[PDB]
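Practice problem. Given the sequence and the SMILES for magnesium ion, write out the predicted structure.
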Amino acid sequence: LTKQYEKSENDLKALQSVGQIVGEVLKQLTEEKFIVKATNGPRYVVGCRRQLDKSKLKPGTRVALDMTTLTIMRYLPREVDPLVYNMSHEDPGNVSYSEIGGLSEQIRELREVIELPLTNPELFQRVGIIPPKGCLLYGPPGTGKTLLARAVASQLDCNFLKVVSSSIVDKYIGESARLIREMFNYARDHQPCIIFMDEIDAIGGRRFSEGTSADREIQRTLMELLNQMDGFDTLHRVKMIMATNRPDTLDPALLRPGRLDRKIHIDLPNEQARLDILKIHAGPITKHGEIDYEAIVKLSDGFNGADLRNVCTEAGMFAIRADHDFVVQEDFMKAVRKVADSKKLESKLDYKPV
Amino acid sequence: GVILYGPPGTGKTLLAKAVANQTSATFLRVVGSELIQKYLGDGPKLVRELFRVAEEHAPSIVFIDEIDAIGTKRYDSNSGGEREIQRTMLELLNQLDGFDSRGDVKVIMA
Amino acid sequence: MKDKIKENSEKIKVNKTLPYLVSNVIELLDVKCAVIKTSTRQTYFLPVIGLVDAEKLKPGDLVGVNKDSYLILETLPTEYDSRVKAMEVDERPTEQYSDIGGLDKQIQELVEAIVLPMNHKEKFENLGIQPPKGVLMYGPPGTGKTLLARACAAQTKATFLKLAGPQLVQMFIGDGAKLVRDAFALAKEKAPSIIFIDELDAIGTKRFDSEKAGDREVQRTMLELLNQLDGFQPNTQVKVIAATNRVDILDPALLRSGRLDRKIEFPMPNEEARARIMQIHSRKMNVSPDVNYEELARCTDDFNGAQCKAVCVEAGMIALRRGATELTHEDYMEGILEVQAKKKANLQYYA
Amino acid sequence: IDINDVTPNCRVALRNDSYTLHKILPNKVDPLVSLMMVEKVPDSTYEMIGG
Amino acid sequence: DVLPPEADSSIMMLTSDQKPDVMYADIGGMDIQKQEVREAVELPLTHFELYKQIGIDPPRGVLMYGPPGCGKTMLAKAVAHHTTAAFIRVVGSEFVQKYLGEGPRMVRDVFRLAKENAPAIIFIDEIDAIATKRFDAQTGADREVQRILLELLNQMDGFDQNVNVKVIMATNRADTLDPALLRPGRLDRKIEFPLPDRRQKRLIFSTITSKMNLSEEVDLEDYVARPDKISGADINSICQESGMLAVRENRYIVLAKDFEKAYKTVIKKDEQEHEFYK
Amino acid sequence: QSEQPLQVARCTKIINADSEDPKYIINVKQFAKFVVDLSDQVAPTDIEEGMRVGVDRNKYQIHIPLPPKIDPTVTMMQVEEKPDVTYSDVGGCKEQIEKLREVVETPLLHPERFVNLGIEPPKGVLLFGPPGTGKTLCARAVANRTDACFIRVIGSELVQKYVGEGARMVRELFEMARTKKACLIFFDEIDAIGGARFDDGAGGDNEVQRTMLELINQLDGFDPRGNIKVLMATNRPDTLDPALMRPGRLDRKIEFSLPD
Amino acid sequence: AHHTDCTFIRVSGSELVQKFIGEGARMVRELFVMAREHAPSIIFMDEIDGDSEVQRTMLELLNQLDGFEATKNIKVIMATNRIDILDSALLRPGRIDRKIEFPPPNEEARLDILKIHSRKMNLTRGINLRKIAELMPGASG
Ligand SMILES: Nc1ncnc2c1ncn2[C@@H]1O[C@H](COP(=O)(O)OP(=O)(O)OP(=O)(O)O)[C@@H](O)[C@H]1O
Ligand SMILES: Nc1ncnc2c1ncn2[C@@H]1O[C@H](COP(=O)(O)OP(=O)(O)OP(=O)(O)O)[C@@H](O)[C@H]1O
Ligand SMILES: Nc1ncnc2c1ncn2[C@@H]1O[C@H](COP(=O)(O)OP(=O)(O)OP(=O)(O)O)[C@@H](O)[C@H]1O
Ligand SMILES: Nc1ncnc2c1ncn2[C@@H]1O[C@H](COP(=O)(O)OP(=O)(O)OP(=O)(O)O)[C@@H](O)[C@H]1O
Ligand SMILES: Nc1ncnc2c1ncn2[C@@H]1O[C@H](COP(=O)(O)OP(=O)(O)OP(=O)(O)O)[C@@H](O)[C@H]1O
Ligand SMILES: [Mg+2]
Ligand SMILES: [Mg+2]
Ligand SMILES: [Mg+2]
Ligand SMILES: [Mg+2]
Ligand SMILES: [Mg+2]
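Answer key:
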C-alpha cells in the first residue's frame, strides 16, 4: 500500500528525533545567554536558538532544552499535571438534581455560590459584595454530599476539578503541596473553575502540635491549600466545594469563613425528605399493589439516603428470595425493618464544625 | 542481679561508684529516665542496644540508676504513654532473664 | 517500495531493541508532541511521539521509551503495585459450602449478594433494583468468617483479591491509599471480581479529633477505601466482602448502607451447629461408630467453630497418646477439656 | 599530606577518580559553634547587669 | 563565571500589576497592628538614620500571629500596596521541594534578591510549614525542612544593620513555631492579631458596609453589640451573606432583615455552655 | 572479569508471556524502571511477577532470580546457637512438657504417626503463668532439642517507630518462616503486642493492635499458614486479644502454675 | 561564662540542634562529648514553665557529673521560675551545690538597670531616671 509506505517512512524520520530536556527560564542574562532550571535538576547558564522569539521567554516560562548543548528549543505552555488532568476529565455519572431528594434548600445554597456568581457577576457587584468562593458540604454519612457534587458537576456548564483528598497525598518531599499548587494553577488558567475536594478531613484535619513527620508533611499540604483559597494572591473565578462527614476534626483556618464561606449541612432526611428519596429509588422497581410509602417512612427515622436505597434493594432481594418478579409493600416492610437492625452498629454521626 | 533501694541520699550511687572504682569489668551507667525516648519502639530499642554493648565488652557491669524514674515521671515527649513504658519494661525483662543467653553481664539497679 | 518498507522495518528493530526506559506520559501538546516523565525522574519533551499513535496515548499512560533518545517505542500495560498483584489468589482454595456448619442463613445472605448479581444479573435488572454493594461479616472469633470467604473463592470463577487490614497500613504517606485504589483498579479490569478485606478494623478504626497526635495516615487509607466503595465514580462491578471481630470499632462511614450494604452477624454455633462442625472436621479421621456428637455439642456450650474443630484435633491427640488407631467418645470428651482450657483447680471439695 | 594532620571531622579534598585525599580544606564550623548560633543567647558582661 | 546577584532566583518580586488592591483604609480597626507594622517595617525602611540617631535597633523581622481571620495576610497586602520598597511574597510550603537542596537554595535566593533590591520586604505567609519545632532525622521531609529553617536563620543572621531588608512572617499557630525563629536578630517584633473587640467590630462593620448599598433602616450597632467573639472574616461573611439575600430577592439594597438572617447563618454558634455553670 | 555484578531489581509485569518474545518490566530500586527481556542462560518459567531478580548494568536483562527481601532485624531473629538448657532442667512441668512436646516437637520428629491417622496436630501453644514459672525456660529447652528452624521473637521487638512497620515485620517474619520445610516461631512476652483491641476515643494502641491483627492474619487467615508451629509465652494472658487466644492461632493453652 | 572563658552551651532540647549534638540523639549525655572538648564549659538550661524535660535533663547531667565524669571544669546551670515546683531529686542536698535567688529589682536596682539600657539611646541631659524607676513598682529588668 502507498499509504503504508508513508506511515513507515514517517516512522523512520521520527526515529531520528531526540528528546528535549524540559526546564524553566529563570532570568535572561544577555541577548544570547539564559539561566534555566531543569524540572527536577540543576540550574544552567544556557543559550537559545536564534529563530526563537526570546520575548516569550519571560522568567518562569517552561522551555525545552537540547540534551547535549542544553540550548533552548522552544517555549512550552504551562504544564498540566497528569493527576490534575484526571481531575478535570473525571466522569460524574450524569447525575441530575431530580435524583436528589430533600436537599432543595441545600442545593440552592450550593448553586448560589458556584452558579450565579459565575454567570451574573454584575448582580453581586451592584450590591457591593464579593461573592463567596468556598462552600463546605457536611453531614452524617450517606446524606448526599458526594451525590450533590456529582449533580453539580454533571449539570453545571463550567470547568470542574474533582479530586479525593486522599488521592493527592504523595510520599515524595513536597509533592502533595505541589499538587495543590498545580490544581489552583489549572483553575486560574481555566476560569471559571470549580474544585471539589471530597473527604477533606484526609488532609484538612486539625494541625497537630506534637505530630509525626508524616503529619507535618500533610499539614504543609493543608496550609499550602489554605494559601490558595485565601492568601496573598486573590482567587478570582475559582470556586471550591469541600465535602466531609467529620467536620469537627478540620482545622479552624480551613473552616474560617474567608476560605469556606458557606457551611451547608446535608443533614439526615426528615419525614418528607425520606418520602422523596424513597420514591426516587423505588421508582424503577417493579411492584404490584398499593405501596404505603408513609409506612416505610415512619420506620425509617434515622435513615440516610443510602438506607432508603438499601430498603429498595433489600425489598427486591426479598422478592428474589421468594422467586418473585415484583416487590410488594410487605417486601418493603421487612426491608425497612432489616435495615433498621443494621443501624445499631453505627456509632455517633452528629458531628458539626466548631 | 542486684538492686540497691532506700531513701534518697543513703549511698546507692556511691556504692556503685565504689564498685566501678575496683572493677576489672566494663562499667555501663544509664539512668532510668534515659530509657524514656521520644519515639515509639526507641525505648525498647535502646534497652536492647545497651545490653548489646554489655555483651561486646564482656565481662561488664550495667548500672541502671534511678530505674523507678522510667515510670514515676511522665514526659509529653514520650509519644506512647504508659503503654510505651510498659513495652520498654518488657524489653528490660527479656534482657535481664530471657531467651537469649546472657554472657558475663552483672546488672546493678538503684 | 516493498523492499524499502522491509528495509525500513529492519532499522526499527535495531532501535526498538531492549531495554526500554519505562516512562509516564505527562501531556500531549500540538506545536502531535508529547511530554514524558521518565522513571529516572526526568521530564522530556518529544517533538514527535514516536512509534505509537498520539490518539492512543493519554496523560498518565505508562510507556516504554528509548533509553537514549527517550522516544516512545511502545505503550505499556497499566501499572499495579506488586503487593496488590500478590494479593490476587490463583490457587482457589478447595473449601465447600458443605464444609461450613450452622451458617446456612449467613451463606445465603452472602451468596445472594456477591454471587447472584454476577451470575444472574437478570434477576436484578427485571426487578429494577440495584444489587447490594459491599457485604460485611462480623461476629465473635472462630465463627467462620474467613472460612466462608474461602468457600466463596472456592465456588466462584470471578477474580478474588484476598486482603488483610494491616496490609493497607504503610509507612509512607499515600502508599496505603495507592494500594487501596490499585486493588480496585486491578479488580475493575478483571471484572467480575471480589475483594475480601479480612480484619477490617486495622484500617477502619473510627476517626477522632485530637490536638496532639493521631493515626491520620490510616484514616487517610480508610478514607480512600470509602471513596472506592462509594465515591464520585460509582464502581458497580467489584464485589467487596469485609470481615471483622469488633464492629463497634469501625468508623460509621465505613458501615454505611452504600459501602457495606449487608452486615451479616455470625453467631456462636448453637447445639445443632456444634455437632455439625465436629462432624465436618472428623471426616478424614478414623472415628468409632459410637461417638455421640449430640452429647459433645451439649458439652461444648459457648464454643465457637474453632474450638469445635480443636475438639476433633485434640481427640486424635489423645488417641495417638494412648496408641489407638480409632477415636472413641471418651477421646472427644476429654479433648473438650483440653479445648476448654480450664485452669487447674483442686475443687474436689465441691458437693 | 601527612596522615597525622588528617584529624577526624576535618574537611578534605578528594580527587575526581581515585578519591585520593590530596588537600586539607579549612575546617568547617564547630558543631558547638553552630549549635550556639541557632540558640543565639545574647552575649553579656558584668557591666550590663544591674542590681 | 560570576552571575549577577539578582540573577538565579526562582522567586521573583512583586510587579506593579501583582500589587494587591487592598488599601489601609480597606482594613478597619487595626490601629495598634497598623502602627506596630509601620514602626517595624515601613518606617525603618525610610527612616533608618533616625533610628540610628535615637539609638533604637530596628527589628530585622516581624511575626504576625493570631486567630485566623484577624487581618494578618491582608495587612501584608496593604503593606505591599502602600510601599515604595520591593515586596517578595512567599508561603513556607513552596520551600519544601522534591529536589534535595532546592529548598535551602531558594531560601537564599529570596534573601539575595531582597538584599540586591533594598529596600525590600520579605513576606513569608504560613511560616509553620518550615518552622515547626519537631524534626525527625530519619525522614527526608524533616531533614530537608531542618535545612530550610537553618538556612533561614543563617540568612537573617547574615544581615547586618546596613542592609535595609525587612522580613514579615505570618502564622495562626505560633505555638508550634521553633523558639530559635523568635530569637533577637531574627524576629524581634511579635505582633498579635487577636479577635476584634467591640470597638474593633464596629470599625470592621463600618468599613465593609461602606462599599455596600445599605438602607437607612440598618442599624449596625445591633450586631456589633452582640457578645459573639467573631473575627473580621466573620464580619465580612455576615455582610457578604447580607448582600447574598438581597441578590436572591432581586434587590440591590441590604435591609435589616437580610443582616439579621446573615448574622444568624454565619455565626451558627451552638450554645456549648450550660446555664447551671453560672 | 568472568562474573559481572548484578543490580537487584523486582519484576513487576510480564508482557506477552504466551508468545516467544516475553518482555519483563523490572523496578531497579531507586534507579529506574526498565522493560527488559530474559537472559538466555535462565528459563522463562523461573521468573514470576513480583519476584526479585538480578540484572546486569548494560542491557538490564534478568540474569538470576533472588530470594525475597527480609529485614536484617527479622533475619537475626532465628536462633543459630541453641541454648544449653534441656528438658531435664525443668522440674514439676511433666504434664506441661508432654503437651508442649506433642505439638511443637513430636509432629516434626515423627510426622508419619499423624498423616496415617488423618490427624492435623495443633500448630500453636500458649505458655502462661506467673513470672519465674518456667515459661521461657521450656522454650529454651524446645530450641535446644528442635531440629527445625527456631525463631525467637520478643513482643517488644515488634514495636516500631513508624506506621505499619510493626505489621511489616510480622509479614516478613512469616514469609521467611515459610521458606523452610518446618519452622518454630517463639513469641516471648506476647502481651507487648497481643493486647486486646479497644477504642478510647483517641488512637490508643491503634498501631500495635495492627501488628497484632497482622499476627492473627498470618496464624489463621485466608491463606494457609504453612508448617509453622508458633509458641507464645506471657505472664499476662488476661490482656491478650480474644482473636489471638482462639484455637487455630493458639490451640494449646499450657499453664505454668507454681509448682506443687 | 564570658568572664571565666568557659564555653556557654544552652540546652533547650531543640530537635533543630540535634544534628550538631550527634546523629544518635538517644541521650542528652551525648552533649558531654562536645562539652569535654570545650572545657571549661557551662551547660545552661532555662525552664520556660506532664513532667519537665529541662528538669529531667538536669538530673541526667548531674548524675554523670557526680562522680562518673573524668574531665573537670564542666559546670551546669539551671534557670527556673520557682523553686517549690522543683523535683525532690534536684532539691535533694548534694545535687545543686548553690541556689541563687533573682528577686525582681527594687527601686534602686531598677535605677541601675535603667541606667544601663538608657546608654544605648540619645538621651537629653537631665533625665530623672530615679523618678521613672519609682514609676515602675514590681517590674522586671
Ligand atoms: N437526598 C438523596 N436523594 C437520593 N439519593 C440519595 C440522597 N442522599 C443520598 N442518596 C443515595 O445515597 C448513596 C450514597 O450517597 P453519597 O455518595 O452522596 O454519600 P455522602 O453524603 O457523600 O456520604 P459519605 O459521608 O459517606 O461521603 C447514593 O447511592 C445516593 O443515591
Ligand atoms: N554511707 C555513706 N558513707 C559516706 N558517704 C555517703 C554515705 N551515704 C551518702 N554519702 C554521700 O552522699 C553523696 C550523695 O549520695 P548518693 O549519690 O550516693 O545517693 P543515692 O543513695 O544514690 O540516692 P538517690 O539517687 O536516691 O538520691 C555521696 O556522694 C556520698 O559522698
Ligand atoms: N460454622 C463453622 N463450620 C465449620 N467450621 C467452622 C465454623 N466456624 C469456624 N470453623 C472452623 O474454624 C477454623 C478457623 O475459623 P475461621 O478463621 O475461618 O473463622 P473467623 O470467624 O473468620 O475467625 P477470626 O474471627 O479469628 O478472624 C477453620 O478451620 C474452620 O473450619
Ligand atoms: N479589620 C478588618 N477589616 C476588614 N476586613 C477584615 C478585617 N480583618 C479581617 N478581615 C477579613 O479577613 C479576610 C481575610 O483574612 P486574612 O487573610 O486577612 O486573615 P489571616 O489572619 O491572615 O488568616 P489565616 O490565619 O486564616 O491565614 C478578608 O476577606 C477581610 O474581609
Ligand atoms: N520448672 C522449673 N524447673 C527448674 N528451674 C526453673 C523452673 N522454672 C523456672 N526455673 C528457673 O527460674 C528461672 C526463671 O526464668 P524463666 O525464663 O523460666 O521465667 P519466666 O517464667 O519466663 O518468667 P517471666 O514471666 O518473668 O518472663 C529460669 O531461668 C530457671 O533457672
Ligand atoms: Mg462521599
Ligand atoms: Mg543516685
Ligand atoms: Mg479471620
Ligand atoms: Mg492568610
Ligand atoms: Mg520469660
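Check your answer against the key. The longest strand of chain C covers residues 20-29.
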